[PDB]
Amino acid sequence: TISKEYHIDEEVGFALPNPQENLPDFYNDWMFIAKHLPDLIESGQLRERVEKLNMLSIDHLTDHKSQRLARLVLGCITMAYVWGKGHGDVRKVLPRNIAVPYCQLSKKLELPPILVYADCVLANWKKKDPNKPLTYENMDVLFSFRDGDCSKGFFLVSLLVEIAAASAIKVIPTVFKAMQMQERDTLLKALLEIASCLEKALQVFHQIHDHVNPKAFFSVLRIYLSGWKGNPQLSDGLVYEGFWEDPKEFAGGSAGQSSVFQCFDVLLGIQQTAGGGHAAQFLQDMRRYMPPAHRNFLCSLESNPSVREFVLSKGDAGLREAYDACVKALVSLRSYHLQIVTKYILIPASQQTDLMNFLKTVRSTTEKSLLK
């Protein structure tokens, strides 16, 4: 089985298992702002509460779980401070009392000082009842931006798909051992089990329609998910007062930072990061926005022999069909996700396309990997 140094959980995969909900009492001033973002933003009191904070030291965040929660807390606060009510009045400077500990904690965890997928999805969750299973009914997010932003449905359904896809990660060492030991039947069973997991993850995706509405997602949630890299509203980036002199550019939170989808593209030899195109550049860049242990895991998968080249060289129809079932399952996930992006982004944008092209390129690359 996969090394503990990669920080992949047997149950939740790349998600942070049982994330911390409360920080030490020393950080109550950060927690108050983070827990009341909807109210402070709406009332125009948020920027003042952030500006009134004292610079708190990161030294009292003793373990990884408390450091991850503080990163989620500070990152949510930073998005609300920069974007405000989300109507054009942006802030181009982040106050030193929040920027200094945010950048120091970010340097410690090897993550950029901006809200990432590992913060808002992987560490932004809790079980309502610890004795009940990981189902939507028994779960909640830790932080939201606005009342009615559908951040619970959006972040939780992504997390549930991450968790569903994680049951196929345990099969990865079985695949590489079967190839090395030349165990054809073992490899075929392993590939069919990965396909089975990815097919099941598509059913999990269907839940998006019951917990997210297009108007609230597009007009409200979208604003706080935005970053400051190539953003016309913050063309030079954000100033991290007291940490860097010049404004720094960082891309906003993205599911392109999910390690579970990138690890199946690497496993199946779908060269998403090859060819010098825009989609390849984006997905490669998003690896530096992943937790270092997860970024290391992706490297290690790439360093292993190609499953695609192995299957292509055997002249075995059963093995080729098991490989194609894995690729077809990823194509179906991405095709369904394209229909979702049309419903939640494309159509609401018309009632008020570069993202669609990115998703269509990634999907096309997956489709072109079928051996047929």
Ligand X SMILES: O[C@@H](c1cn(-c2ccccc2)nn1)c1c(Cl)ccc2cncn12
| Contacts with ligand HEM, residue ranges (CB under 6 A) | 154, 157-158, 161-162, 205, 208, 212, 217, 254-256, 258, 261, 334, 337, 340-341, 344-345, 355, 358-359, 362
Among ligand X, ligand HEM, a second copy, none, what does residue 222 contact (CB within 5–8 Å per kind)?
ligand X
* 337 assigned ligand-binding residue: yes
- Rounded CA-CA distance 177/304 in Å is 11
CA atoms within 13 A on the CB side of 6: 21
Which of the listed partners (ligand HEM, ligand X, a second copy, none) does 273 bind, with a CB threshold of 5 to 8 Å by partner kind?
Answer: a second copy
> Exposed, middle or buried by CB within 10 Å (0-12, 13-18, 19+), for 77?
buried
Q: How far does CA 339 lie from the centroid of its chain?
A: 20
Q: What is the DSSP letter of 142?
A: S
- To ligand X, the closest distance from the beta carbon of 347 in angstroms equals 12
What is the Cα–Cα distance from 162 to 156, expressed in whole angstroms?
A: 10
Could you give the C-alpha distances from 325 to 266, 329, 337, in angstroms and in order? 16, 6, 18
For residues 174 and 1, give the distance between their C-alpha atoms in angstroms, rounded to a whole number: 8
Token pair listed for 269: 């030899």
| Site residues (CB under 8 A) for a second copy, limited to 149-188 | 172-173, 176-177, 180
The option from ligand X, ligand HEM, a second copy, none interacting with 162 (CB < 5 to 8 A, set by class) reads: ligand HEM
Query: Which of 158, 167, 262, 369 lies at the binding interface for ligand X (CB under 6 A)?
Result: 158
To the nearest whole angstrom, how small is the minimum distance from the Cβ of residue 255 to ligand X? 3
Q: What Cα–Cα distance (Å) separates residue 143 from each residue in 69, 73, 117, 321?
A: 10, 8, 13, 43
Q: Toward ligand X, which CB reaches closer, 226 or 369?
A: 226
Binding-residue pattern over the window 239 to 258 for ligand X, x denoting contact by CB under 6 A? --------------xxx---
Q: Does residue number 346 form part of the binding site for ligand X (CB under 6 A)?
A: no
The single residue among 93, 274, 347, 356 that binds a second copy, judged by CB under 8 A, is 274
Is residue 15 within 8 Å of 72, Cβ to Cβ? Answer: no
Q: Which residues are annotated as a binding site for heme b?
A: 337
Residue numbers at the binding site for ligand X (CB under 6 A): 117, 120-121, 158, 222, 225-226, 253-255, 345
